[PDB]
Amino acid sequence: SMEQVAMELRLTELTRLLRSVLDQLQDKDPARIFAQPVSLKEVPDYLDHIKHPMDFATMRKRLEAQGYKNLHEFEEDFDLIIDNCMKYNARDTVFYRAAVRLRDQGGVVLRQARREVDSIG
Numbered sequence: 001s002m003e004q005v006a007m008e009l010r011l012t013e014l015t016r017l018l019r020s021v022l023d024q025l026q027d028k029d030p031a032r033i034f035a036q037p038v039s040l041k042e043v044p045d046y047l048d049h050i051k052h053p054m055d056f057a058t059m060r061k062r063l064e065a066q067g068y069k070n071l072h073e074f075e076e077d078f079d080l081i082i083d084n085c086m087k088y089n090a091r092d093t094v095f096y097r098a099a100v101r102l103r104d105q106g107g108v109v110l111r112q113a114r115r116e117v118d119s120i121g
Contacts, residue, residue: 011069012066013120014117015064017113017116017120021110021113022056022063022074025056025078025109028101028106028109029056033098033099034056034081034099035057036055036057037055037057037058038050046088050088052080053084054077054081055081056081058077059074059077062077078110081099081102082103085098085099086100
């Protein structure tokens with residue numbers, strides 16, 4: 001149907017806007033601490049601690065399959081990256097600190113993304 005196509009064009013445009021959001025959030029991680037999944041070879045107990053691992057490559061795979069239906073879903077995944085790190089790593093670590101800085105800086109980008117998704121629909 002024509003309606004299904006219109007909906008697909010909306011999903012495609014959301015995906016376009018989320019790709020730009022993702023690139024902007026990832027620029028706030030210049031150390032690349034969050035670029036890839038935590039390695040289970042290098043951190044064998046990780047899944048005893050963290051039940052839903054997340055990272056920027058895994059988000060990008062979902063994004064390119066148009067697997068984010070709305071901004072809320074994409075935000076949930078970004079929040080996992082941050083929150084997983086702040087639980088596994090202690091307050092005095094470069095990892096924890098990197099997550100705090102990502103959250104703070106990412107908030108700015110997310111605030112305007114939300115306005116743009118509501119505004120453009």
